[PDB]
């Protein structure tokens, strides 16, 4: 059946000899060359530039809370930055984080030393870990640390930031102690002496250029990701490809999810109107989500394939008619191709003189076997 058009005709008629005439055998159809997707000029990226790029950060004794939601965030962008050093991620990996969705993406900011960077691990203990900030055992998210000795470093000494050196009670995850009640050093009661009996819990950082890695002020963040049985408001952004016209493509214009040939159109939409329809109630035109143009949509060209043959006793040559098809979009092509209102005629040569009709093609064209 699939050897050549004459044999397809034989298969359709279930006969080994086909009489003179035009027979519909196959059904031509054009498949999309590529998939095209476009989304408008809107990003609403989460305010990472404000939280990371700033002048002064919140100290560790009051670890700040950011509460970032209802925005798309490209975490791999910062994962592809040029400054970050520590990227020890707990639970959800950033590459899957971009794919996965969370309701809220909390961020933190506190000032810790290089040796105490390991303390931000879930359940890790230490001075800062057990007094200033502690992460729960079941944390999911990433903590980012990097070296910055030129922005937040002082030659004489950085004593602005300070930590909770002493704390009577036991810290719990997601807890803060902003009150500055005076510590009780010994078993004697404390009455604000600031001497042997009473120690000052908030001890100042000492930052010097000659200090080691365990004494250097680093800019760290805790990207706390949690599930609150709520609709997800933070998700990964989606890319839009380039635009192509006069070609059969698969388009997803903000949910139009159709296929067809996009072309320029003179029709104009109303400013609020997005796409158009017609009598048949089918998608007719869509405006560009990015820019302001109107793209008329025409479905994929398709039509019956009719094999034009004389009787097998006369000959075995055939001509193939591609109904309602332009010969730009079309026996294999290149053998006396011809265009008429019926469609593309392949295998037959147009002749200027006119004879009586033998095999009716359509729109006044008739094919015949001749010298």
């Amino acid at each position, epitope marked *: 059946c699939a050897l050549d058009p004459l044999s397809e005709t034989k298969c359709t008629l279930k006969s080994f000899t086909v009489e003179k005439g035009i027979y519909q055998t196959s059904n031509f159809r054009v498949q999309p060359t590529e998939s095209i997707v476009r989304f408008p000029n809107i990003t609403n990226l989460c305010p990472f530039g404000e939280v990371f790029n700033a002048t002064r950060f919140a100290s560790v004794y009051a670890w700040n809370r950011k509460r970032i939601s209802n925005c798309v965030a490209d975490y791999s962008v910062l994962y592809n930055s*040029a400054s*970050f050093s520590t990227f020890k991620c707990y639970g959800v*990996s*950033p590459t899957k984080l971009n794919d996965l969705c969370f309701t809220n993406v909390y961020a933190d900011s506190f000032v810790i030393r290089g*040796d105490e960077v*390991r303390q931000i691990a879930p359940g890790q203990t230490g001075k800062i870990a057990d007094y200033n900030y502690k992460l729960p055992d079941d944390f999911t998210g990433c903590v980012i640390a990097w*070296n910055s000795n030129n922005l937040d470093s002082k030659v004489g000494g950085n004593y602005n930031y300070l930590y909770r050196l002493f704390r009577k009670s036991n810290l719990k995850p997601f807890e803060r102690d902003i009150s500055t009640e005076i510590y009780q050093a010994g078993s004697t009661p404390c009455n604000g002496v600031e001497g042997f009996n009473c120690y000052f819990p908030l001890q100042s950082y000492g930052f010097q250029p000659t200090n*080691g*890695v365990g004494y*250097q002020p680093y800019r760290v963040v805790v990207l706390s990701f949690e599930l609150l049985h709520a609709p997800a408001t933070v998700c990964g952004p989606k890319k839009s490809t380039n635009l192509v016209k006069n070609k059969c493509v698969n388009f997803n214009f903000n949910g139009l999810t159709g296929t067809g040939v996009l072309t320029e159109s003179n029709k104009k939409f109303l400013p609020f109107q997005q796409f158009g329809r017609d009598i048949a109630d089918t998608t007719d035109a869509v405006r560009d989500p990015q820019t302001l143009e109107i793209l008329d949509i025409t479905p994929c060209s398709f039509g019956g394939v009719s094999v034009i043959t004389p009787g097998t006793n006369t000959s075995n040559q055939v001509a193939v008619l591609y109904q309602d098809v332009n010969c730009t979009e079309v026996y294999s092509t290149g053998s006396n191709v011809f265009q008429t209102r019926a469609g593309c005629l392949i295998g037959a040569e147009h002749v200027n003189n006119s004879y009586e009709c033998d095999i009716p093609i359509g729109a006044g064209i008739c094919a015949s076997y001749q010298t």
Partner: antibody
Framework: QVQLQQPGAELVLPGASVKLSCKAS????????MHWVKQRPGHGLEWIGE????????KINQKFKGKSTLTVDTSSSTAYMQLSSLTSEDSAVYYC??????????????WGQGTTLTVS | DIVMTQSHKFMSTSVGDRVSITCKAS??????IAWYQQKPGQSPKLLIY???TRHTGVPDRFTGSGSGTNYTLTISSVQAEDLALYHC?????????FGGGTKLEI
């Protein structure tokens, strides 16, 4: 049990190109960047470069620019590395290093088997 | 960038003696260093990912101590399996550089 498998023992004539692969198993292929290192008894180890998976962010060390090329195939957890115009001094052992963390810098906590390159 | 080069030519101590493994640094970049145990005919094995804390599967004999200017590693006890190459690699910037390595011999 992490399986970092390298066939090794490949020889290519001078002036041609080479292709090497490194299969990764025992962990998740998605959650780790790729970092390439080179082993030489002449002056110790050295770093070839890094490539992130399922993307085309190229970052190679300043010592081995131009000749070195890296490609990543998601399927079968293989990494594609190519040199051009191999010289006689390129007789050494090549490695693929699984990193400790997903982000730079990394100290290449776990190393796989050694692939030996030699002019034949 | 930063260049790693140890000072001592080789490690030459008997069984149980205490020896030091140096790893000089071009400039002060903190304790951003690693250590590899590359047996002759075997791939490097992790020993010291950080000076303060040691990674999984390491003997307690090996000690971590970062000077800040150059990196030195001291082993309290030495066994037969401790004879290998000591490669030291710094992790502070995108270009990574390894040390010259030293092979322990008795």
């Amino acid at each position: 049990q992490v399986q970092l498998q390298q066939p090794g023992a490949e020889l290519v004539l001078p002036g041609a190109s080479v292709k090497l692969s490194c299969k990764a198993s025992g962990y998740t292929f998605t959650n780790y960047w790729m970092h390439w290192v080179k082993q030489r008894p002449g002056h110790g180890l050295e770093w070839i470069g890094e490539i992130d998976p399922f993307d085309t962010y190229i970052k190679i060390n300043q010592k081995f620019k131009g000749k070195s090329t890296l490609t990543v195939d998601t399927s079968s957890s293989t990494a594609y590395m190519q040199l051009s115009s191999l010289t006689s001094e390129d007789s050494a052992v090549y490695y693929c290093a699984r990193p400790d963390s997903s982000g730079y810098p990394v100290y290449f906590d776990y190393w796989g088997q050694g692939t030996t390159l030699t002019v034949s | 960038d930063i260049v790693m080069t140890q000072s001592h030519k080789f490690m030459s101590t008997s069984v149980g003696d205490r020896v030091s493994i140096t790893c000089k640094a071009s400039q002060d970049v903190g304790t951003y260093i690693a250590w590899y145990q590359q047996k002759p005919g075997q791939s490097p094995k992790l020993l010291i990912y950080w000076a303060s804390t040691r990674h999984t599967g390491v003997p307690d004999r090996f000690t971590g101590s970062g000077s800040g200017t150059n990196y030195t590693l001291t082993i309290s006890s030495v066994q037969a399996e401790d004879l290998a190459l000591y490669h030291c690699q710094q992790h502070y910037s995108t270009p990574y550089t390894f040390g010259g390595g030293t092979k322990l011999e008795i």
